[PDB]
Design a protein around this ligand. Structure first.
Ligand SMILES: *[C@@H]1O[C@H](CO)[C@@H](O[C@@H]2O[C@H](CO)[C@@H](O[C@@H]3O[C@H](CO[C@H]4O[C@H](CO)[C@@H](O)[C@H](O)[C@@H]4O)[C@@H](O)[C@H](O[C@H]4O[C@H](CO)[C@@H](O)[C@H](O)[C@@H]4O)[C@@H]3O)[C@H](O)[C@H]2NC(C)=O)[C@H](O)[C@H]1NC(C)=O
Ligand SMILES: *[C@@H]1O[C@H](CO)[C@@H](O)[C@H](O[C@@H]2O[C@H](CO)[C@@H](O)[C@H](O)[C@H]2NC(C)=O)[C@H]1NC(C)=O
Ligand SMILES: *[C@@H]1O[C@H](CO)[C@@H](O)[C@H](O)[C@H]1NC(C)=O
Ligand SMILES: *[C@@H]1O[C@H](CO)[C@@H](O)[C@H](O)[C@H]1NC(C)=O
Ligand SMILES: *[C@H]1O[C@H](CO)[C@H](O)[C@H](O)[C@H]1NC(C)=O
Ligand SMILES: *[C@H]1O[C@H](CO)[C@H](O)[C@H](O)[C@H]1NC(C)=O
Ligand SMILES: *[C@H]1O[C@H](CO)[C@H](O)[C@H](O)[C@H]1NC(C)=O
Ligand SMILES: *[C@H]1O[C@H](CO)[C@H](O)[C@H](O)[C@H]1NC(C)=O
Ligand SMILES: [Ca+2]
Ligand SMILES: [Ca+2]
Ligand SMILES: [Ca+2]
Ligand SMILES: [Ca+2]
Ligand SMILES: [Ca+2]
Ligand SMILES: [Ca+2]
Ligand SMILES: [Ca+2]
Lengths: 310, 141, 105, 142
């Protein structure tokens, strides 16, 4: 009768596959699948969908605490990454290659000798602590450490435990990948791994250039900052405020709040034309929708976000 | 950290190594600020050190809300708008006694309408049945 | 299509709120999930005192194995009731607050 | 490609990053001595390029952690805007509105790919008209 559970129980029909452990043997949701989340919802390890608004509301809504994973930064729960150590004076962690290298690396000098507080970069602790892999000097004494792939166990500070170095901030230009091996990166289509870590752009694309407003006029320059070309000079005491570009049509769009107009030009110059000249009294910013060829703009005289064709 | 000079002169050489001027407050590893921004009402500091735990000194020209959150101008006390968050500025305000008018005002005999005292005996019948221009009104020349 | 006293008022308050037809249509499909959480919580609320009496009866019997086995099931059953208690309260607060804000102007 | 959003602050003087859902907040630069008044920002490969009204220059910083942002074209005015122009900065995808304007009478505007039952677009109406019951035909507002 009803849904016979994995261990013989009359579980209700609605209970199976509702993102929850209902069966006594944890087998009430194995045989089905669950639909994915709409863009107005967010994910959990339960296969569940939760409201966008619940994320970082402070509530453990989905068992992982996953919708509350680090809603805050520069904070007390450091639990610092492999080959790192914390100077007691502040909420700061510094790599072992810096800690007690002879130069103050924590700004307060909390990683070098401080005789006034009776602290020296000692190494005697390793003799009795008997580190598993290696030891290093700290103001406390000889601190035990273990190789990349692993962190010092917090129970004893003498053992070391397997780790997900994919967590280090600055690991990769996209993702960690080639995992089960400790860590390196992988880069998406159109990128190549120069040096390791670096997702360098493919040679098949034109040279990257930065276009920007120097305050009055639109300028163009390469990534190395060796060349600077004026793309378009402002007329009638104008001011280039917000710039954006469309690649496929090779056009550059910018706004002029002093002239209260929006302009568009070709990347090499010429074909300069006004795009909007009514109710555009203060076009604070700009963004093009290259897939649908739309121009999202921000207006601040009457606070709104408008959409127009290119 | 603000370009008040419009040339960036005032913010030049302002490294983290240094102190605030004697007449400035310090935000923890963020910026120095005018003491005018200390207890201005809003947090200028990254961690709100400028607004931390200080108390209001609302003046006689101002009224302090019951919740003690903020002070408002004396003009806004008893006006018919809830300027305070807890509606304390409109709590305990005067009213007309039932069916009657303030010691100030004049009352229309026709329908009990309260009108300004000056509108009794000013030549114009400001009342529905001319109560405010009765025979006892001494005329003006 | 509602039975819970809590959900019935929320739907009545929803029809007088600022909800767009699309928002109101999606609101009903959320109340259906909200009711399922309540009925699941209500079902386990009966089970908590049912097993509580079962645990009390077994503790009177005095068998250490039956007492240990029933206690192991009981403390896990209590967690099931307690965790659903907040699941229902959090959903109730969000639904009540949203319709409160949509009616407040 | 990382599904992250970078924003800058002119008042608390930081550059920070969160995922598209707001989780996993991290700081890439902060303090009045580093980012006194950032206004515009853009990024390419491993670098973030931002303009600042106080140093009056476009800056280069690492997208992860920058101890001291390098200068780039120091200017005599407030630099108001910056963006990197490259092909990989505009990835390549199929627009739902490409199919005969998505059947919309006047305007076809994108949405989230799951929205509108997986169509990923909604029809919009110009100022002089309103959207009808079928959410496809535009009729004059009354
Ligand atoms: C989104 O989709 C579009 C369309 O498919 C892609 O656009 C293509 O991008 C590739 C990559 O750069 C282009 O390939 C290059 O084409 C050049 C010539 O094409 C231009 O000129 C012809 C006319 O002569 C036009 O028909 C064409 O539309 C282009 O305007 C070649 O010169 C390039 O090769 C050169 O460099 C390589 C080294 O990199 C050398 O080995 C070669 O010998 C040669 O010197 C190259 O083949 C392609 O042309 C683009 N097509 C269009 C229509 O734009 C977007 O890139 C894509 N975006 C992404 C990132 O997905
Ligand atoms: C706005 O810009 C469009 C071009 O995209 C332009 O056609 C509009 O009208 C033009 O305005 C000019 C300046 O007022 C005017 O000299 C010109 O004759 C006129 N062109 C036509 C045929 O309409 C622009 N509008 C405004 C008011 O600037
Ligand atoms: C030791 O540390 C591990 C984490 O590495 C922790 O799970 C465990 O509870 C600790 N205690 C013992 C003695 O295992
Ligand atoms: C103003 O209010 C403060 C509140 O801290 C109080 O200490 C002080 O005596 C008052 N008088 C003045 C004008 O300082
Ligand atoms: C998952 O389900 C959602 C429901 O809104 C969408 O249909 C989405 O498109 C599905 N996922 C994929 C990968 O198609
Ligand atoms: C702190 O720095 C300020 C910067 O205006 C002055 O140089 C001041 O003399 C300094 N005070 C001390 C004690 O170093
Ligand atoms: C208003 O003031 C009168 C005195 O003129 C009375 O105190 C009256 O009770 C007040 N109104 C209310 C609502 O209490
Ligand atoms: C009218 O007012 C004038 C003002 O100059 C004189 O006071 C005059 O005597 C008044 N008339 C009467 C009848 O009192
Ligand atoms: Ca289940
Ligand atoms: Ca939450
Ligand atoms: Ca050091
Ligand atoms: Ca302040
Ligand atoms: Ca008032
Ligand atoms: Ca009168
Ligand atoms: Ca500032």
């Amino acid at each position: 009768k009803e849904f016979e559970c994995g261990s013989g129980e009359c579980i209700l029909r609605a209970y199976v596959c509702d993102h929850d452990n209902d069966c006594e043997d944890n087998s009430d949701e194995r045989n089905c699948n669950y639909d994915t989340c709409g863009g107005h919802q967010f994910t959990c390890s339960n296969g569940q969908c939760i409201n966008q608004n619940w994320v970082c509301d402070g509530d453990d809504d989905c068992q992982d605490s996953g919708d509350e994973d680090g809603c805050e930064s520069n904070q007390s729960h450091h639990r610092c990454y492999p080959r790192e150590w914390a100077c007691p004076g502040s909420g700061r962690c510094i790599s072992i290659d810096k800690v007690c290298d002879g130069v103050p690396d924590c700004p307060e000098g909390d990683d070098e000798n401080n005789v006034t507080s009776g602290r020296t970069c000692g190494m005697g602790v390793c003799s009795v602590l008997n580190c598993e892999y290696q030891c290093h000097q700290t103001p406390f004494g000889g601190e035990c450490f273990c190789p990349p792939g692993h962190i010092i166990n917090s129970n004893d500070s003498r053992t070391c435990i397997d780790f997900d170095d994919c967590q280090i901030w600055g690991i990769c230009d996209q993702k960690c990948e080639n995992r089960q091996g400790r860590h390196q990166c992988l880069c998406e289509e159109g990128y190549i791994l120069e040096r390791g870590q670096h997702c360098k752009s493919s040679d098949s694309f034109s040279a990257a250039s930065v276009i920007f407003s120097n305050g009055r006029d639109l300028l163009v320059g390469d990534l190395h900052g060796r060349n600077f070309r004026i793309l378009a000079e402002s007329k009638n005491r104008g001011m280039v405020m917000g710039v954006d570009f469309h690649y496929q049509k090779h056009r550059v769009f910018w706004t002029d709040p002093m002239q209260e107009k929006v302009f568009s030009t070709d990347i090499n110059g010429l074909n300069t034309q006004e795009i909007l000249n009514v109710s555009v009294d203060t076009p604070e910013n700009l963004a093009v929708d290259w897939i649908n060829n739309k121009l999202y703009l921000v207006e601040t005289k009457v606070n709104r976000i408008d959409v127009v064709n290119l | 950290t603000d370009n008040d000079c419009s040339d960036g002169s005032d913010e030049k050489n302002c490294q983290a190594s240094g102190t605030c001027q004697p007449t400035q407050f310090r935000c923890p590893d963020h910026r120095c600020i005018s003491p005018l921004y200390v207890c201005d009402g809003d947090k200028d500091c990254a961690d709100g050190s400028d607004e931390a735990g200080c108390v209001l000194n609302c003046t006689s020209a101002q009224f302090k809300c019951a919740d003690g959150s903020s002070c408002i101008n004396s003009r806004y006390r008893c006006d018919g708008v809830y300027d305070c968050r807890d509606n304390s500025d409109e709590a305990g305000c005067p009213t007309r006694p039932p069916g009657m008018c303030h010691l100030d005002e004049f009352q229309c005999q026709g329908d009990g309408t309260c009108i300004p005292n000056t509108w009794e005996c000013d030549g114009h019948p400001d009342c529905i049945h001319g109560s405010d221009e009765h025979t006892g009104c001494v005329p003006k020349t | 299509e509602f039975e819970e006293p809590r959900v019935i008022d929320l739907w009545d308050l929803a029809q007088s709120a600022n909800f767009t037809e699309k928002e109101l249509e999606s609101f009903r499909e959320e109340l259906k999930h909200f009711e399922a959480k309540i009925e699941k919580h209500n079902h386990y609320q009966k089970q908590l005192e049912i097993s509580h009496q079962k645990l009390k009866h077994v503790e009177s019997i005095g068998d250490p194995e039956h007492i240990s086995r029933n206690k192991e099931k009981y403390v896990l059953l209590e967690e099931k009731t307690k965790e659903l208690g907040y699941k229902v309260k959090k959903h109730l607060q969000d639904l009540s607050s949203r319709v409160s804000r949509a009616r407040h102007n | 490609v990382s599904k992250r959003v970078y924003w800058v602050d002119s008042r608390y003087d930081y550059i920070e990053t969160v995922t598209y859902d707001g989780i996993q907040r991290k700081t890439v630069a902060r303090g009045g001595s580093l980012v006194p008044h950032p206004f515009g920002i853009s990024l390419f490969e491993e670098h973030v390029f931002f303009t600042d009204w106080t140093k009056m220059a476009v800056m280069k910083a690492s997208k992860f952690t920058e101890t001291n942002p390098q200068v780039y074209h120091q200017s005599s005015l407030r630099p108001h805007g910056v963006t990197v122009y490259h092909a990989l900065r505009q990835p390549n995808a199929t627009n739902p509105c490409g199919s005969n304007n998505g059947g919309c009478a006047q305007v076809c505007v994108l949405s989230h790919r799951t929205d509108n039952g997986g169509l990923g677009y909604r029809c919009k109406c110009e100022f002089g008209f309103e959207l009808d019951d079928d959410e496809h035909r535009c009729v004059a507002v009354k």
